[PDB]
Design a protein around this ligand. Structure first.
Ligand SMILES: CCCCCCCCCCCCCCCCCC(=O)OC[C@H](COP(=O)([O-])OCC(O)COP(=O)([O-])OC[C@@H](COC(=O)CCCCCCCCCCCCCCCCC)OC(=O)CCCCCCCCCCCCCCCCC)OC(=O)CCCCCCCCCCCCCCCCC
Ligand SMILES: CCCCCCCCCCCCCCCCCC(=O)OC[C@H](COP(=O)([O-])OCC(O)COP(=O)([O-])OC[C@@H](COC(=O)CCCCCCCCCCCCCCCCC)OC(=O)CCCCCCCCCCCCCCCCC)OC(=O)CCCCCCCCCCCCCCCCC
Ligand code: HEA
Ligand code: HEA
Ligand SMILES: CCCCC/C=C/C/C=C/C/C=C/C/C=C\CCCC(=O)O[C@H](COC(=O)CCCCCCCCCCCCCCCCC)COP(=O)(O)OCCN
Ligand SMILES: CCCCCC/C=C\CCCCCCCCCC(=O)O[C@H](COC(=O)CCCCCCCCCCCCCCC)COP(=O)(O)OC[C@@H](O)CO
Ligand SMILES: CCCCCCCCCCO[C@@H]1O[C@H](CO)[C@@H](O[C@H]2O[C@H](CO)[C@@H](O)[C@H](O)[C@H]2O)[C@H](O)[C@H]1O
Ligand SMILES: CCCCCCCCCCO[C@@H]1O[C@H](CO)[C@@H](O[C@H]2O[C@H](CO)[C@@H](O)[C@H](O)[C@H]2O)[C@H](O)[C@H]1O
Ligand SMILES: CCCCCCCCCCO[C@@H]1O[C@H](CO)[C@@H](O[C@H]2O[C@H](CO)[C@@H](O)[C@H](O)[C@H]2O)[C@H](O)[C@H]1O
Ligand SMILES: CCCCCCCCCCO[C@@H]1O[C@H](CO)[C@@H](O[C@H]2O[C@H](CO)[C@@H](O)[C@H](O)[C@H]2O)[C@H](O)[C@H]1O
Ligand SMILES: C[C@H](CCC(=O)O)[C@H]1CC[C@H]2[C@@H]3[C@H](O)C[C@@H]4C[C@H](O)CC[C@]4(C)[C@H]3C[C@H](O)[C@]12C
Ligand SMILES: C[C@H](CCC(=O)O)[C@H]1CC[C@H]2[C@@H]3[C@H](O)C[C@@H]4C[C@H](O)CC[C@]4(C)[C@H]3C[C@H](O)[C@]12C
Ligand SMILES: CCCCCCCCCCCCCCCCCCCC
Ligand code: CUA
Ligand SMILES: [Cu+2]
Ligand SMILES: [Mg+2]
Ligand code: NA
Ligand SMILES: [Zn+2]
Lengths: 44, 72, 56, 143, 102, 227, 513, 44, 49, 40, 70
């Protein structure tokens, strides 16, 4: 969910990873975590 | 959480035990036993003990525990 | 006494752009001006007192 | 390809040897001839000229590995400038000696030092290694 | 094991409908490892570039093989040797043939 | 005393100072080795174009990283604590001397037998005799018998001072209302110098200590002459 | 608008900026004091006056460098700027109390400069030991002004510690555990716990000194049954934790800089790094009497303090080796910030090792109150804390400002400062071993060569400080605006652009479980 | 409030020469103060 | 195209080095600084009493 | 990092002025005090 | 045709070779340091005191005029 057309996602790719992977998710086609490939879709 | 208490167990508690084990295993050599003095407030015998010859304490150590009459 | 919290909620949520320290009205401005005048004036007096105490 | 401040939240282009395939093309907008070149790229690459292959590389990427990894003469500027400013420091120390420092104590006079040196040898200052140890008391000279 | 690692990576790049994102993810992940990829892995990545109509990424893959070899100057010319049949078949010019080593 | 361009400790005048020199050599070898190993490893990490940027497993290597340092610290601690307890051992002194710190000079009291006390002030630079050391000479030296165990008791009648003689391995704080003890034994006759070692105001730099170590018979006659 | 923004701030970034400006000004004062010290010692004889004016300069040098330069820059500046951004928080827990932590410091600094202007100053050392600091040997207002300076700096840091602990515990994304926060955030939480526990004990001790000076108490006066050594215990119970407070945020910045310029997504051995910082913080409370090995304590006490102090080398070593293991296999970028961090790893190690020499009470008899101690602490402070500050400053300046530095100038700055600090402090080891005391305005003639070289070093460091001011001017003068920053996926503080908007994370991050 | 480069600071960077003057006074006053304090203590 | 370092690097390195050595040698030897070196192998001891 | 070219480039001459003014702001006041120490 | 070179574990191989190199050097420096500093100091003190005559040392000092008490 977002009240705008982009939001920062933090992806904890595997349980108990200390490293969080951060990226902007934009309105439109699903994007993938650049570390694990997990799909995220914005719902403004 | 379990993760925090495991972190304390291995990161603080067992290291403490290891350090106290090292401390102890460095001061573990036998102390020089003191001259026997037949003090009336020590080696009390009001009734024989219910084991052995009645005159030896339960965890009697010949090296450091004298009898009423002195070291064995 | 009576519960007048609703009337104070209306006053402090009024859409007037005032910061919370001035939003009670004219008395807040007065108490703000007294406080800041004593602080700034007292600070100038503390500086004068250092000037004085810096010489025998 | 003009990169704008207001684009910080969008996927961006990088030349990094550890990130060889970046998130976007170097050049996104294509001229008529560049559009024809991308169509030609869908056919056999054997039919592309060397110039066409270089143009396809330069649309996708800004610098080659050889370009992004190149060495520079920057070390000359850094070492030389550091030595200049260290030299400038010696000017401050010359100024300080001339205009700030007065005479040093009379105990540094050559004759004082000669007498203090003998007195240190007479009291056998550091006779095992440090000082008197280096004096030959038999021959009356330094070892 | 080495053979199992190499087989996983060949399979990854050989997926017929591999997309551009997967091609990049693969190469950007692969270059993090303490190795220069075996020619069979590079061959499969270059054929993925062909299915994706991406000539430039094929050249870039050859550059990153050279880069991962570091001071070991014998590795890159060995890998190019092993890839020559694939380079000829797909019309892939090396970075050297394109002057991109200057 | 120190000499120009000196790198290390003043030569040892007492057996304990000899012990501290050998302990310092052992410790400094370890410091040199660890310093060197870290610099070398930095330089190794920074001199290759080869890369490995994926997640690396820590636990095996952390065993080495903890056990080896623990062993090295034990190898320092063992001789460190042997020397600590050796200085603390019972020795039976032949003589007790007191020193009182003052702004800015030392007084000495030798009261085993007679009431012998005196003040000990820095020789001003303008009054040094040829050959004498700036900021180190005193008017009245602390004459003591060589090759004898001496109990030194240290206090102050004003602010903190600290009574130090580096070549004997000595430094005892001078605290008003407190009597601190140390033992002094010189293997050699001579002159042994120290300087006040606790900030004590305007002339902290200018209240030194000079021990004069001589045969017992000379010390006895000096003592008698100082009453 | 200007007053509302800069005097009435409730914004973590602007308050961070106020702290960095305050710290930079303080660093110039501390540098000037350091040059007066080395001018006095740069040739044998007397330059300024006797030990009183000299020790006023030494005392002020230490208080300015520690309380007005390092703590405000590391905690107030980097901590306020980075901590909220690194956890996706919209500000600090107590954004108005945050502003009071900042505004207490100008008055604290004013009281210290007043101490030096009235009477003959506070020539006490930064430890302020009685009876020299008492109302007989330091009659008049100077020491009381120093005590009040410390009281205001203490309240500033206690309220700041409450703010950081609360923010770091309470304001992370709900999916983020403490074991998913960056090392810099851990380094600030641990430093804040040390401040919370240590500063109140200092406050109690200096309050007792105040009452001995002004209300006829005798806490430290043997005439009333007091003990000067009690003051030392209370001071050092604070003072050892204080040095871990000065280095911990530097350890956190070094972890980030080494990771970033190695091209890594993460530091080597994250949980080991957290363990090491918590271990150092804990051990730092049980070692204080290594500052008191010559006061006359019992041998078993000296044995305990020797042993407990040496234990700190184990967790500290895990951090040094973990930094080396972060470099291992990196795509190394030889940025100015990387040069600061690499100098840190080496020079901090040397100063840590001379600390281990000093931990040995037997050897400390001869090294205590000598320049060997001065060499130890300037390796860890003037080449450790300062190198971490300079590394963090050149790394994050473009985040804070939106502008780039000239990297060539920044490398020149590093090279000059590296030569100057080593030339200043390396020879002080020789002065310490050979017996030169601390807090001396003049030295026996034998010590002239190393004091001469040390003073020349200090002038090279001055040239570096002057160049740094020019480098910051050149960045604001030229206005090179940041475009792209690498590795934003593992450096959240950069992901809102350069500089970030006044309000960030108005909509919080999405992190699922 | 103004946002962006040169606007998130309590000093102006609109003119690099006015900025040099302000930075000179700022850092210069900090560096000068101890020399003038020593002068003050010597002149009593 | 050639940058600052390509154009000026050689001159900055040569001039900086020459200047630094010259001014430090002058400071060390020509303005009366007392280094107080070791008397060992240097000073002839002289009667003091 | 990448960045735009300077919006207000600082020429070598302008840099020599800034560096000179910066150094003088540190050196002249301290210099004046240290030169006059004997007078004090 | 070129031979297949080693392509895997090149960074690990370099690390293993050089860490062993550093260990071997550490042992060489410790042996050197034992010899040039530590043992040299023990032998300098042992040799100084072996036939040391404290009364003769004192007599030389006394005759040089160094003492207040003699
Ligand atoms: C950028 C830099 C700019 C300038 C920096 C200033 C440099 C100062 C120059 C020093 C040169 C000394 C000198 O005159 O040498 C003659 C000197 C004369 O020899 P010697 O009289 O036989 O001295 C032997 C000592 O007696 C040996 O016994 P001692 O008891 O006399 O020895 C003690 C001495 C011994 O220490 C030293 O000799 C210092 C060596 C430092 C190397 C740099 O002091 C120390 O303990 C120093 C403490 C150092 C702390 C830890 C440093 C970590 C090292 C980093 C490792 C990296 C290595 C690569 O020759 C040397 O040994 C060279 C030093
Ligand atoms: C012992 C004391 C402790 C000292 C600590 C010193 C450190 C304090 C830290 C805080 C700094 C002060 C800022 C807050 C309040 C200042 C008040 C004021 O007037 O300021 C004007 C002034 C700026 O003047 P502007 O350029 O005309 O103003 C532009 C405004 O937008 C235009 O605004 P406007 O047009 O509405 O009106 C502005 C107007 C006036 O605006 C007002 O309406 C304000 C009226 C009340 C102000 C009360 C606050 C006073 C400051 C208290 C701190 C002490 O300003 C003026 O032009 C005239 C003001 C003259 C007073 C100057 C006071 C500055 C600090 C003094 C330094 C230390 C002196 C000690 C002497 C030592 C002797 C022994 O602010 C400053 O002084 C800032 C510092 C100077 C620039 C240095 C740049 C260095 C860069 C280093 C890099 C580190 C940062 C890295 C990251 C950067 C990216 C994020
Ligand atoms: C940032 C500041 C800082 C830091 C971090 C430290 C860290 C340490 N300090 Fe220091 N210290 C000071 C600032 C600091 N110190 C100051 C200001 C004083 C003087 C106070 C005054 O009187 O004014 C001082 C004084 C002081 C004394 C008192 C000496 C005296 O007055 O006589 C001692 C005594 O033990 C001490 C020891 C230590 C030790 C053991 C560490 C340890 O934390 C160091 C640990 C680090 C390492 C050991 C290096 C890395 C480790 C490895 C590579 C692993 C392998 C190592 C081994 C096996 C040994 N220091
Ligand atoms: C952080 C602490 C710190 C720092 C950095 C320093 C730095 C320096 N110190 Fe000092 N010093 C102490 C803390 C520090 N000192 C303490 C605690 C004492 C003991 C006091 C006592 O005995 O009571 C002491 C004592 C001391 C003495 C011993 C005095 C004596 O015993 O008589 C000497 C002698 O040379 C000395 C010199 C110097 C020199 C030449 C520097 C130079 O290296 C300084 C060079 C300049 C810098 C390092 C720049 C600083 C500025 C910044 C980093 C600003 C950055 C700006 C931005 C980020 C925008 N200091
Ligand atoms: C190793 C960890 C601890 C082990 C615990 C003990 C082991 C054996 C017995 C277990 C029962 C312990 C309970 C406490 C009772 C009394 C004594 C036990 C303490 C002990 O073990 O003490 C020993 C003596 O035991 C003696 O007398 C002999 C004791 C044996 C007979 C005891 C009989 C008395 C029982 C009393 C029961 C009362 C129960 C109360 C219930 C209350 C409900 C309302 C000490 O040895 P020692 O040689 O004197 O000195 C050592 C010299 N080297
Ligand atoms: C010799 C004389 C020297 C004395 C120096 C005196 C120093 C300063 C003068 C003090 C002026 C105090 C004015 C009141 C301050 C109140 C702070 C407060 O109450 O702060 C709160 C947070 O601290 C909390 O809770 C919990 C913490 C509350 C702390 C209250 C203030 C403490 C002041 C002194 C503390 C010293 C510590 C004593 C132990 C050594 C609120 O945080 P804000 O950011 O405001 O708001 C957040 C909003 O969401 C609220 O709706
Ligand atoms: C709103 C901004 C803040 C307002 C600032 C107000 C400042 C004016 C204060 C008046 O100054 C006073 O002067 C008295 C002298 O007339 C002093 O008396 C004291 O000092 C005298 C000196 O003669 C002595 O009689 C005694 O100590 C004592 O009465 C006293 O110290 C001082 O305060
Ligand atoms: C007393 C302490 C003194 C410290 C001395 C500081 C020395 C200053 C170094 C500046 O010189 C440059 O450094 C670059 C790095 O900063 C080099 O980059 C080159 O070399 C690197 C490989 O080592 C690569 O990462 C780069 O891609 C490449 O361009 C570049 O060629 C070189 O001229
Ligand atoms: C003291 C500095 C020296 C740094 C030593 C760091 C050693 C780190 C090794 C851990 O990384 C490993 O490397 C292997 C490939 O070689 C991988 O297969 C393995 O999965 C990985 O965990
Ligand atoms: C630790 C930081 C300091 C490092 C060293 C500072 C370097 C010196 C910078 C120059 O400072 C100036 O030097 C002049 C002399 O060279 C002084 O003029 C003085 O001397 C002149 C020549 O005799 C006279 O003409 C002037 O009237 C007289 O004020 C002048 O006042 C002073 O500002
Ligand atoms: C009458 C009034 C009602 C309050 C209300 O409900 O508004 C009562 C409720 C509780 C009362 C208070 C409590 O009973 C406790 C106090 C009792 C004392 O006898 C008078 C004062 C005292 C402090 C009371 C004042 C006042 O009468 C209160 C406040
Ligand atoms: C258990 C805990 C957290 C593990 C996790 O949940 O990820 C880890 C983190 C750091 C670890 C410690 C550090 O690696 C330092 C030590 C390393 C030794 O090999 C074992 C003990 C040692 C003291 C470790 C014990 C334990 O494995 C710790 C404390
Ligand atoms: C967030 C709590 C994590 C516990 C870590 C335990 C390991 C460190 C042990 C030393 C310090 C413990 C003090 C709490
Ligand atoms: Cu007496 Cu210092
Ligand atoms: Cu400590
Ligand atoms: Mg002391
Ligand atoms: Na002097
Ligand atoms: Zn993921």
């Amino acid at each position: 969910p977002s009240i705008t057309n982009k939001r920062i996602v933090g992806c904890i790719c595997e349980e108990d990873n200390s490293t969080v992977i951060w990226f902007w998710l934009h309105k439109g086609e699903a994007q993938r975590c650049p570390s694990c490939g997990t799909h995220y879709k914005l719902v403004p | 959480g379990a993760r925090t208490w495991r972190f304390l167990t291995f990161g603080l508690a067992l290291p403490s035990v290891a350090l106290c084990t090292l401390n102890s295993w460095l001061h573990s050599g036998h102390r020089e036993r003191p001259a026997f003095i037949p003090y009336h407030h020590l080696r009390i015998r009001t009734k024989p003990f219910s084991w052995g010859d009645g005159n030896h304490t339960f965890f009697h150590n010949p090296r450091v525990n004298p009898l009423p009459t002195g070291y064995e | 006494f009576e519960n007048r919290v609703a009337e104070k909620q209306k006053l402090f949520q009024e859409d007037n752009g005032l910061p919370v320290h001035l939003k009670g009205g004219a008395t807040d401005n007065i108490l703000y001006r007294v406080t800041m005048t004593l602080c700034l004036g007292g600070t100038l007096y503390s500086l004068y007192c250092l000037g004085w105490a810096s010489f025998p | 390809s003009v990169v704008k401040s207001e684009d910080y939240a969008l996927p961006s282009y990088v030349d990094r040897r550890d990130y060889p395939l970046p998130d976007v093309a170097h050049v996104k907008n294509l001229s008529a001839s560049q559009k024809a070149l991308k169509e030609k790229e869908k056919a056999s690459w054997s039919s592309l000229s060397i110039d066409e292959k270089v143009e396809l590389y330069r649309l996708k990427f800004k610098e080659s590995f050889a370009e992004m990894n190149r060495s520079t003469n920057e070390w000359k500027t850094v070492v030389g400038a550091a030595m200049f400013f260290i030299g400038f420091t010696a000017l401050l120390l010359i100024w300080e000696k001339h205009y700030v420092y007065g005479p040093i104590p009379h105990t540094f006079e050559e004759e004082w030092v000669a007498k203090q040196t003998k007195r240190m040898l007479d009291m056998k200052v550091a006779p095992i290694q440090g000082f008197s140890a280096k004096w030959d008391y038999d021959k009356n000279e330094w070892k | 094991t080495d053979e199992e690692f190499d087989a996983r990576w060949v399979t990854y790049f050989n997926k017929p409908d591999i997309d551009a994102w997967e091609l990049r993810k693969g190469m950007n992940t692969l270059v993090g490892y303490d190795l220069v990829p075996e020619p069979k892995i590079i061959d499969a990545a270059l054929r993925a570039c062909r299915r994706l109509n991406d000539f430039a990424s094929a050249v870039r893959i050859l550059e990153v093989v050279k880069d991962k070899a570091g001071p070991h100057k014998e590795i890159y010319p060995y890998v190019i040797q092993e890839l020559r049949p694939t380079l000829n078949e797909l019309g892939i010019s090396t970075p050297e043939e394109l002057g991109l080593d200057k | 005393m120190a000499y120009p361009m000196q790198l290390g400790f003043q030569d040892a005048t007492s057996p304990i100072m000899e012990e501290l020199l050998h302990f310092h050599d052992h410790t400094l070898m370890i410091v040199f080795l660890i310093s060197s190993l870290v610099l070398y490893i930095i330089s190794l990490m920074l001199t290759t174009k080869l890369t490995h940027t994926s997640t690396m497993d820590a636990q095996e290597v952390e065993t080495i990283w903890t056990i080896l340092p623990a062993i090295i610290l034990i190898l320092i601690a063992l001789p460190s604590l042997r020397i600590l307890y050796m200085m603390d051992e019972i020795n039976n002194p032949s003589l007790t001397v007191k020193t009182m710190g003052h702004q800015w000079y030392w007084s000495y009291e030798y009261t085993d037998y007679e009431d012998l006390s005196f003040d000990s002030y820095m020789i001003p630079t303008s009054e040094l005799k040829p050959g004498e050391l700036r900021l180190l000479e005193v008017d009245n030296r602390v004459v003591l018998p060589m090759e004898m165990t001496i109990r030194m008791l240290v206090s102050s009648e004003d602010v903190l001072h600290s009574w130090a003689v580096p070549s004997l391995g000595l430094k005892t704080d001078a605290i008003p209302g407190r009597l601190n003890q140390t033992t002094l034994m010189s293997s050699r006759p001579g002159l042994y110098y120290g300087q006040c070692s606790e900030i004590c105001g305007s002339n902290h730099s200018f209240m030194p200590i000079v021990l004069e170590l001589v045969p017992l018979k000379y010390f006895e006659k000096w003592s008698a002459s100082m009453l | 608008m200007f007053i509302n923004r800069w005097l009435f701030s409730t914004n973590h970034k602007d308050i961070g900026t106020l702290y960095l400006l305050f710290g930079a000004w303080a660093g110039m004062v501390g540098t000037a004091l350091s040059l007066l010290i080395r001018a006095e010692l740069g040739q044998p004889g007397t330059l300024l006056g006797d030990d009183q004016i000299y020790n006023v300069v030494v005392t002020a040098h230490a208080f300015v460098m520690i309380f007005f330069m390092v703590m405000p820059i590391m905690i107030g500046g980097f901590g306020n700027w980075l901590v909220p951004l690194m956890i996706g928080a919209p500000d600090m827990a107590f954004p108005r109390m945050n502003n009071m932590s900042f505004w207490l410091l100008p008055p604290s600094f004013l009281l210290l400069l007043a101490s030096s202007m009235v009477e003959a100053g506070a020539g006490t050392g930064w430890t302020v030991y009685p009876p020299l600091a008492g109302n007989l040997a330091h009659a008049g207002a100077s020491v009381d002004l120093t005590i009040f300076s410390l009281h205001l700096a203490g309240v500033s840091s206690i309220l700041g510690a409450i703010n950081f602990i609360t923010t770091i515990i309470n304001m992370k994304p709900p999916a983020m555990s403490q074991y998913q926060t960056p090392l810099f955030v851990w380094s600030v939480m641990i430093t804040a716990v040390l401040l919370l526990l240590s500063l109140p004990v200092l406050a109690a001790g200096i309050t007792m000194l105040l009452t001995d000076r002004n209300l006829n108490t005798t806490f430290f006066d043997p005439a009333g049954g007091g003990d000067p050594i009690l003051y030392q215990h209370l001071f050092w119970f604070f003072g050892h934790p204080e040095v871990y407070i000065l280095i911990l945020p530097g350890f956190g910045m070094i972890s980030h800089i080494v990771t970033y310029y190695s091209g890594k997504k993460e530091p080597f051995g994250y949980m080991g790094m957290v363990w090491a910082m918590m271990s150092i913080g804990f051990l730092g409370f049980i070692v204080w009497a290594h500052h008191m090995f010559t006061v006359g304590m019992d041998v078993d006490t000296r044995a305990y303090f020797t042993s407990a102090t040496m234990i700190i080398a184990i967790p500290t070593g895990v951090k040094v080796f973990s930094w080396l293991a972060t470099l291992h296999g990196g795509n190394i970028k030889w940025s100015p910030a990387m040069m600061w961090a690499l100098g840190f790893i080496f020079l901090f190690t040397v100063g840590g090792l001379t600390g281990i020499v000093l931990a040995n009470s037997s050897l400390d008899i001869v090294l205590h109150d000598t320049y060997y101690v001065v060499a130890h602490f300037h390796y860890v402070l003037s080449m450790g804390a300062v190198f971490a500050i300079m590394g963090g400053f050149v790394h994050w300046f473009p985040l804070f400002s939106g502008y780039t530095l000239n990297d060539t100038w920044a490398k020149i700055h590093f090279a000059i400062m590296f030569v100057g600090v080593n030339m200043t402090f390396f020879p002080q080891h020789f002065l310490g071993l050979s017996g030169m005391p601390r807090r001396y305005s003049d030295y026996p003639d034998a010590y002239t060569m190393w004091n001469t070289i040390s003073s020349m070093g200090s002038f090279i460091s001055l040239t570096a400080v002057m160049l740094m001011v020019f480098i910051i001017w050149e960045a604001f003068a030229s206005k090179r605006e940041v475009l792209t920053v690498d590795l934003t996926t593992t450096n959240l503080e950069w992901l809102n652009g350069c500089p970030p908007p006044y309000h960030t994370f108005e909509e919080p991050t999405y992190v699922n479980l | 409030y103004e946002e962006g480069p040169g606007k998130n600071i309590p000093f102006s960077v609109e003119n690099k020469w006015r900025l040099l003057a302000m930075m000179t006074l700022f850092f210069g006053s900090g560096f000068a103060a101890p020399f003038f304090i020593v002068r003050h203590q010597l002149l009593k | 195209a050639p940058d600052f370092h390509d154009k000026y690097g050689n001159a900055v390195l040569a001039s900086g080095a020459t200047f630094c050595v010259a001014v430090w040698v002058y400071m060390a030897t020509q303005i009366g600084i007392e280094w107080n070196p070791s008397p060992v192998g240097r000073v002839t001891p002289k009667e003091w009493r | 990092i990448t960045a735009k070219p300077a919006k207000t480039p600082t020429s070598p001459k302008e840099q020599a002025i800034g560096l000179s003014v910066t150094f003088l702001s540190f050196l002249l006041p301290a210099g004046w005090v240290l030169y006059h120490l004997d007078n004090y | 045709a070129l031979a297949k070179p080693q392509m895997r574990g090149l960074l690990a191989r370099r690390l293993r070779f050089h860490i062993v190199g550093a260990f071997m050097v550490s042992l060489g420096f410790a042996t050197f340091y034992k010899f040039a500093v530590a043992e040299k100091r023990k032998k300098a003190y042992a040799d100084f005191y072996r036939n040391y005559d404290s009364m003769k040392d004192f007599e030389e000092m006394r005759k040089a005029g160094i003492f207040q008490s003699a």
